[PDB]
Amino acid sequence: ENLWVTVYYGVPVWKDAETTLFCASDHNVWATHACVPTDPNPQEIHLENVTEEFNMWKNNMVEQMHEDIISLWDQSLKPCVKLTPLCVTLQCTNVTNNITDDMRGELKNCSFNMTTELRDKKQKVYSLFYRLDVVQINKEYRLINCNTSAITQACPKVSFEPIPIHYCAPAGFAILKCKDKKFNGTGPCPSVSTVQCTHGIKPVVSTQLLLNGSLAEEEVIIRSENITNNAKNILVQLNTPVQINCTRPNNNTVKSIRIGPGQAFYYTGDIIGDIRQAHCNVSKATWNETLGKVVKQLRKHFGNNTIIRFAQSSGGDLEVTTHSFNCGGEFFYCNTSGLFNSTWISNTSVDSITLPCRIKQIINMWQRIGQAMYAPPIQGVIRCVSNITGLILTRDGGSTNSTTETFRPGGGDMRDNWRSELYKYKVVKIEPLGVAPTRCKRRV
Amino acid sequence: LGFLGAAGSTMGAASMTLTVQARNLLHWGIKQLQARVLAVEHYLRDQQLLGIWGCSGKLICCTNVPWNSSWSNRNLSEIWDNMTWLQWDKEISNYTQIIYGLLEESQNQQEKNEQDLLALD
Amino acid sequence: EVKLEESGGGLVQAGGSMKLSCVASGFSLSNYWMNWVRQSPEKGLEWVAEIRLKPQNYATHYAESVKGRFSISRDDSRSTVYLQMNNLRAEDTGIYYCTRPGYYGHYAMDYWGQGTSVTVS
Amino acid sequence: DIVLTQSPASLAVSPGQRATISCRPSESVDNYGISFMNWFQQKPGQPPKLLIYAASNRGSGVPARFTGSGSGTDFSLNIHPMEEDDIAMYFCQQSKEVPYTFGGGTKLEIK
Ligand SMILES: *[C@@H]1O[C@H](CO)[C@@H](O[C@@H]2O[C@H](CO)[C@@H](O[C@@H]3O[C@H](CO)[C@@H](O)[C@H](O)[C@@H]3O)[C@H](O)[C@H]2NC(C)=O)[C@H](O)[C@H]1NC(C)=O
Ligand SMILES: *[C@@H]1O[C@H](CO)[C@@H](O[C@@H]2O[C@H](CO)[C@@H](O[C@@H]3O[C@H](CO)[C@@H](O)[C@H](O)[C@@H]3O)[C@H](O)[C@H]2NC(C)=O)[C@H](O)[C@H]1NC(C)=O
Ligand SMILES: *[C@@H]1O[C@H](CO)[C@@H](O[C@@H]2O[C@H](CO)[C@@H](O)[C@H](O)[C@H]2NC(C)=O)[C@H](O)[C@H]1NC(C)=O
Ligand SMILES: *[C@@H]1O[C@H](CO)[C@@H](O[C@@H]2O[C@H](CO)[C@@H](O)[C@H](O)[C@H]2NC(C)=O)[C@H](O)[C@H]1NC(C)=O
Ligand SMILES: *[C@@H]1O[C@H](CO)[C@@H](O[C@@H]2O[C@H](CO)[C@@H](O)[C@H](O)[C@H]2NC(C)=O)[C@H](O)[C@H]1NC(C)=O
Ligand SMILES: *[C@@H]1O[C@H](CO)[C@@H](O[C@@H]2O[C@H](CO)[C@@H](O)[C@H](O)[C@H]2NC(C)=O)[C@H](O)[C@H]1NC(C)=O
Ligand SMILES: *[C@@H]1O[C@H](CO)[C@@H](O[C@@H]2O[C@H](CO)[C@@H](O)[C@H](O)[C@H]2NC(C)=O)[C@H](O)[C@H]1NC(C)=O
Ligand SMILES: *[C@@H]1O[C@H](CO)[C@@H](O[C@@H]2O[C@H](CO)[C@@H](O)[C@H](O)[C@H]2NC(C)=O)[C@H](O)[C@H]1NC(C)=O
Ligand SMILES: *[C@@H]1O[C@H](CO)[C@@H](O)[C@H](O)[C@H]1NC(C)=O
Ligand SMILES: *[C@@H]1O[C@H](CO)[C@@H](O)[C@H](O)[C@H]1NC(C)=O
Ligand SMILES: *[C@@H]1O[C@H](CO)[C@@H](O)[C@H](O)[C@H]1NC(C)=O
Ligand SMILES: *[C@@H]1O[C@H](CO)[C@@H](O)[C@H](O)[C@H]1NC(C)=O
Ligand SMILES: *[C@@H]1O[C@H](CO)[C@@H](O)[C@H](O)[C@H]1NC(C)=O
Ligand SMILES: *[C@@H]1O[C@H](CO)[C@@H](O)[C@H](O)[C@H]1NC(C)=O
Ligand SMILES: *[C@@H]1O[C@H](CO)[C@@H](O)[C@H](O)[C@H]1NC(C)=O
Ligand SMILES: *[C@@H]1O[C@H](CO)[C@@H](O)[C@H](O)[C@H]1NC(C)=O
Ligand SMILES: *[C@@H]1O[C@H](CO)[C@@H](O)[C@H](O)[C@H]1NC(C)=O
Ligand SMILES: *[C@@H]1O[C@H](CO)[C@@H](O)[C@H](O)[C@H]1NC(C)=O
Ligand SMILES: *[C@@H]1O[C@H](CO)[C@@H](O)[C@H](O)[C@H]1NC(C)=O
Ligand SMILES: *[C@@H]1O[C@H](CO)[C@@H](O)[C@H](O)[C@H]1NC(C)=O
Ligand SMILES: *[C@@H]1O[C@H](CO)[C@@H](O)[C@H](O)[C@H]1NC(C)=O
Ligand SMILES: *[C@@H]1O[C@H](CO)[C@@H](O)[C@H](O)[C@H]1NC(C)=O
Numbered sequence: 125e126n127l128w129v130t131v132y133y134g135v136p137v138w139k140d141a142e143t144t145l146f147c148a149s150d151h152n153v154w155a156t157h158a159c160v161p162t163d164p165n166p167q168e169i170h171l172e173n174v175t176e177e178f179n180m181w182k183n184n185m186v187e188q189m190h191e192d193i194i195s196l197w198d199q200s201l202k203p204c205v206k207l208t209p210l211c212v213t214l215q216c217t218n219v220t221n222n223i224t225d226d227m228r229g230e231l232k233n234c235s236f237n238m239t240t241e242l243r244d245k246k247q248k249v250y251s252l253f254y255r256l257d258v259v260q261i262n263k264e265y266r267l268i269n270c271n272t273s274a275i276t277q278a279c280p281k282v283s284f285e286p287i288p289i290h291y292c293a294p295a296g297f298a299i300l301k302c303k304d305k306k307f308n309g310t311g312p313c314p315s316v317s318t319v320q321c322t323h324g325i326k327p328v329v330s331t332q333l334l335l336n337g338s339l340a341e342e343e344v345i346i347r348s349e350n351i352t353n354n355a356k357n358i359l360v361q362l363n364t365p366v367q368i369n370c371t372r373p374n375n376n377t378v379k380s381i382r383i384g385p386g387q388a389f390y391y392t393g394d395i396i397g398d399i400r401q402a403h404c405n406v407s408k409a410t411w412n413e414t415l416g417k418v419v420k421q422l423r424k425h426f427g428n429n430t431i432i433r434f435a436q437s438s439g440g441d442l443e444v445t446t447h448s449f450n451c452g453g454e455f456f457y458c459n460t461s462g463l464f465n466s467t468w469i470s471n472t473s474v475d476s477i478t479l480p481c482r483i484k485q486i487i488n489m490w491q492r493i494g495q496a497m498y499a500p501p502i503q504g505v506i507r508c509v510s511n512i513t514g515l516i517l518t519r520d521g522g523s524t525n526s527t528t529e530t531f532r533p534g535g536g537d538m539r540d541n542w543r544s545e546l547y548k549y550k551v552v553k554i555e556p557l558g559v560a561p562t563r564c565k566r567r568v
Numbered sequence: 569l570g571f572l573g574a575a576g577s578t579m580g581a582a583s584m585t586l587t588v589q590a591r592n593l594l595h596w597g598i599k600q601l602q603a604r605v606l607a608v609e610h611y612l613r614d615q616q617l618l619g620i621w622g623c624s625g626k627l628i629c630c631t632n633v634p635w636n637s638s639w640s641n642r643n644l645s646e647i648w649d650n651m652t653w654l655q656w657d658k659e660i661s662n663y664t665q666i667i668y669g670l671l672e673e674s675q676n677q678q679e680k681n682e683q684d685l686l687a688l689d
Numbered sequence: 690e691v692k693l694e695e696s697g698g699g700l701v702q703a704g705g706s707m708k709l710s711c712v713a714s715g716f717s718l719s720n721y722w723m724n725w726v727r728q729s730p731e732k733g734l735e736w737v738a739e740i741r742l743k744p745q746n747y748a749t750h751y752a753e754s755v756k757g758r759f760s761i762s763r764d765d766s767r768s769t770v771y772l773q774m775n776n777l778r779a780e781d782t783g784i785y786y787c788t789r790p791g792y793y794g795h796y797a798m799d800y801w802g803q804g805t806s807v808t809v810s
Numbered sequence: 811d812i813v814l815t816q817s818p819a820s821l822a823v824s825p826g827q828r829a830t831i832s833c834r835p836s837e838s839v840d841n842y843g844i845s846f847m848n849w850f851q852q853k854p855g856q857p858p859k860l861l862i863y864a865a866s867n868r869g870s871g872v873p874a875r876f877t878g879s880g881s882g883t884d885f886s887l888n889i890h891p892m893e894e895d896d897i898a899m900y901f902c903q904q905s906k907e908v909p910y911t912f913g914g915g916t917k918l919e920i921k
Contacts, residue, residue, distance in 0.1 A: 134586030469794030801857035
């Protein structure tokens with residue numbers, strides 16, 4: 125018959141869209157200052173017969189999280205003390221003590237001329253530094269990067285401890301969540317739910333391994349932006365934790381001086397007791413099981429009859445060639461060798477593992493040119509317990525001309541850490557208006 | 569039948585939930601303001617469009633524009649029972665600009681003139 | 690139970706062309722690696738071709754004796770492997786087999802199909 | 811290519827005696843401390859069956875009488891006791907590199 129246009133409003137149709145999401149949380153550097161109280165029990169509606177496509181590599185939510193984190197880090201340093209007066213001749217000598225030693229010269233005993241509350245007077249002080257914190261002028265020393273940037277002291281009252289952050293949609297928008305398992309972050313998701321907000325995600329800063337993240341539901345999941353391109357990082361999510369115990373055994377003390385009328389500076393004082401190298405302990409047997417699971421899953425993509433090898437990074441900056449921690453307010457760099465030293469031919473390698481670590485007080489967390497922060501030293505012995513929840517691997521081969529392939533730890537790009545948690549979420553815009561042919565007529 | 573629970577349902581079945589869907593349509597400070605202003609401007613645009621059609625008082629309304637069969641080669645029972653709104657919206661996405669234009673030209677522009685003449689007489 | 694079945698063999702005039710095929714069964718073709726070999730009493734066993742998986746960009750390798758006259762390809766969606774050949778010579782006469790690498794690390798032809806005769810004249 | 815030499819071309823062995831077949835690669839087959847030499851057994855009308863892998867490991871389903879040996883560029887297959895069921899062609903293979911190579915197949919017979 126004669127079909128007619130009809131109009132419906134409230135129609136359950138959505139489109140791909142990008143919009144700002146807002147944070148929620150349950151002193152501290154993190155977002156909780158900008159955030160609002162959370163929904164203690166976010167609602168989830170399961171949708172049957174929905175096959176909505178997800179693509180984590182294009183997900184805008186990653187960029188929003190990144191920008192919030194950069195702004196927060198900087199915001200916490202705005203009221204804090206400037207250390208510009210510290211760029212001085214800084215003469216130093218060897219620390220002599222009861223030591224197990226380290227690289228020679230790792231600790232230095234330095235003395236220098238500082239300003240006082242009155243500009244009319246100067247004072248002489250001494251302090252201990254790590255070799256990484258200083259460079260030779262030509263003995264005479266200079267604080268590292270005095271030739272590149274101003275250094276700001278972190279405020280001692282501000283914790284760096286992570287706070288879980290939830291993101292919530294604005295009105296007219298909804299967040300879809302993939303419920304599938306063994307999902308590689310792309311393609312159609314067979315089961316989809318709708319949520320007002322995301323699960324809480326802790327900010328974590330680390331390299332080569334992922335800490336305090338979510339676990340895979342059943343089996344280890346391997347994904348990458350382009351598996352055929354060796355340049356791309358491969359992310360591996362574990363279905364089990366591996367516990368790691370890290371420590372800073374030295375009994376450091378903290379001393380302070382007033383600089384100028386408006387500020388004060390904290391520095392490392394005499395160290396009490398034997399001086400020992402920082403280190404981390406992991407179970408060998410647990411790690412061995414973990415590698416066996418990763419290798420088995422790699423073969424599913426790279427095929428059978430391959431030899432899988434692991435090796436340490438061949439070179440590049442200390443910031444990316446080593447594992448990084450921020451714990452206790454101290455920054456650790458660890459070699460990781462002995463975790464990644466193996467060859468797997470016969471589904472087997474052809475107590476604890478102790479890794480060496482180093483401490484640096486002057487850092488640049490986001491790798492920005494012209495920026496620097498000085499952490500104040502933390503008094504007493506520091507112990508940290510955390511769990512490894514994933515790995516970042518790279519191919520140093522791309523080999524097609526052999527039966528072998530070798531993997532090395534990746535790093536230097538923070539976006540890959542956040543992608544491991546946000547891959548399940550997609551943002552869509554709701555469009556309530558639509559039309560249909562159903563017959564009807566109106567009087568005029 | 570929570571928000572968007574109808575999304576996987578047949579177009580006919582979905583009509584039961586239209587009210588529920590409608591209820592959910594409505595430097596940190598700058599982020600809040602930009603999101604809220606856009607949500608309001610968008611909301612009002614949809615309402616203005618219905619107002620032109622004269623359908624603003626209803627979730628469901630009829631119009632005086634005849635269907636062009638070339639837009640979709642399907643039966644009425646085929647569309648209402650064998651399709652979701654998500655599938656349907658994609659299928660006729662090329663013609664939505666045309667339909668909106670027809671609704672104004674064929675109904676709004678014509679009826680207001682005829683009713684004015686009756687009021688004038 | 691892993692099985693391979695060859696087909697497409699037979700007598701072909703020299704300078705001509707033909708395609709051999711192998712049907713995978715009992716395993717996922719997409720996650721393994723495939724190889725072709727040939728045999729004649731005149732020469733014994735000879736390896737002729739290998740094909741890699743997607744991360745390897747489906748790269749292939751050929752023996753110098755067959756390179757440029759033979760080509761290997763696969764269809765992961767149909768569980769099949771194909772060996773294309775042209776510019777055939779009498780020297781190519783022999784029994785061709787579809788094979789599997791078997792044991793990991795220790796690459797070896799652990800599984801063989803029945804094979805098929807190819808004759809060139 | 812890496813050339814394999816295999817010998818004897820043929821041998822006749824009485825039942826209950828040990829048989830040996832040698833194989834000598836032009837280049838070492840070893841990698842990562844492990845040999846990549848493989849051996850096959852074949853009977854007429856049938857595809858070859860993997861006999862030995864990694865120069866020492868019997869293939870699955872292979873009888874104890876078949877033993878691999880050697881390292882570097884010197885390998886051999888040792889069969890004992892000889893039985894009529896063992897009459898077959900035998901081949902050595904180098905799997906270490908592409909192209910993989912075969913050659914010099916040997917005929918083993920009952921005396
Ligand atoms: C995660 O896994 C899915 C599969 O579960 C991957 O989807 C796959 O994507 C590839 C590349 O597009 C598809 O290959 C096909 O190639 C043919 C031509 O040879 C082309 O015509 C097809 O359109 C397609 O491109 C493959 O079929 C597809 N697998 C499916 C759909 O089951 C996905 O790429 C994986 N994600 C990542 C990041 O690896
Ligand atoms: C990942 O999460 C784990 C906990 O599930 C972290 O381990 C724990 O971290 C907290 C906070 O740093 C440690 O507690 C702190 O203790 C010091 C000293 O008493 C105190 O001054 C601080 O205010 C705070 O209470 C805690 O000791 C530590 N583990 C245990 C067993 O206590 C881990 O550090 C997290 N990883 C990262 C990278 O943040
Ligand atoms: C701490 O003492 C070490 C030696 O124990 C100093 O290292 C030496 O530096 C000189 C002068 O260049 C070299 O000739 C030596 O080979 C070094 N000895 C080594 C490496 O054992 C070091 O300079 C002192 N303090 C520092 C380096 O900061
Ligand atoms: C670092 O050097 C300073 C001197 O510049 C040391 O302080 C003096 O140490 C000597 C013994 O070596 C004492 O006799 C002096 O009385 C100290 N002066 C003071 C305390 O004002 C300081 O001990 C050195 N630090 C370390 C760890 O050896
Ligand atoms: C801090 O200032 C004092 C002077 O108040 C410096 O002491 C001088 O050291 C030089 C070394 O060649 C001597 O020639 C001078 O005679 C010393 N004092 C004076 C007044 O001449 C001391 O070296 C300064 N410290 C640093 C690290 O620069
Ligand atoms: C990191 O440590 C935490 C605390 O031990 C782990 O949380 C526990 O996870 C197990 C399962 O692996 C649960 O059975 C426990 O109930 C959890 N404890 C809680 C929630 O307090 C966490 O799993 C570890 N690593 C992860 C979760 O990836
Ligand atoms: C690689 O090959 C192995 C071996 O065939 C596959 O698993 C084992 O093979 C043996 C006999 O050699 C069997 O008894 C097993 O059942 C096979 N697997 C298991 C889990 O038992 C393995 O699946 C292959 N890998 C890939 C990625 O295809
Ligand atoms: C991580 O550990 C490895 C292994 O100890 C370090 O590599 C060694 O570097 C030294 C000093 O030059 C050499 O003598 C060795 O031959 C290296 N061992 C190798 C290559 O196996 C590596 O330098 C360490 N990384 C860091 C950042 O300290
Ligand atoms: C600062 O000193 C470092 C020492 O490594 C040097 O590498 C760098 O080039 C210097 N920067 C400038 C701007 O001269
Ligand atoms: C992966 O990289 C290859 C080689 O550049 C390219 O051909 C292919 O399209 C890429 N795959 C993607 C982008 O999914
Ligand atoms: C060991 O080191 C501590 C801290 O510097 C010191 O007090 C103690 O006297 C040293 N013991 C010696 C030198 O025997
Ligand atoms: C790490 O291992 C070393 C060597 O066994 C041990 O001395 C040290 O106490 C361990 N650290 C922790 C925190 O258990
Ligand atoms: C880490 O410390 C815990 C106790 O807090 C202990 O049970 C665990 O065995 C330690 N791990 C290692 C590798 O020593
Ligand atoms: C890494 O592996 C090699 C080869 O087995 C070994 O020689 C070396 O000592 C290992 N490095 C360690 C265990 O730190
Ligand atoms: C790994 O190899 C050993 C030795 O051949 C074997 O016993 C074991 O079953 C293999 N594991 C396979 C899937 O796990
Ligand atoms: C490591 O795992 C392999 C493969 O399962 C196993 O053969 C080996 O015994 C393990 N090594 C240990 C537990 O030290
Ligand atoms: C070591 O640090 C602790 C606090 O963690 C402090 O009480 C102690 O006095 C320091 N050294 C000592 C006590 O010898
Ligand atoms: C394999 O060999 C070819 C040349 O035959 C070369 O172009 C290609 O880069 C090689 N691949 C690798 C991974 O080295
Ligand atoms: C999904 O399909 C089934 C029939 O297969 C139907 O009963 C169910 O209502 C559908 N779900 C939705 C949300 O439309
Ligand atoms: C349907 O659309 C076509 C293409 O625009 C047009 O030519 C035709 O006149 C339309 N039919 C109307 C009332 O029937
Ligand atoms: C639509 O109506 C036609 C009338 O011929 C019929 O053939 C066709 O099957 C119908 N479609 C459906 C989905 O019922
Ligand atoms: C609808 O428009 C899209 C984009 O131009 C086009 O690809 C698609 O074929 C169109 N559908 C039709 C004409 O039915």
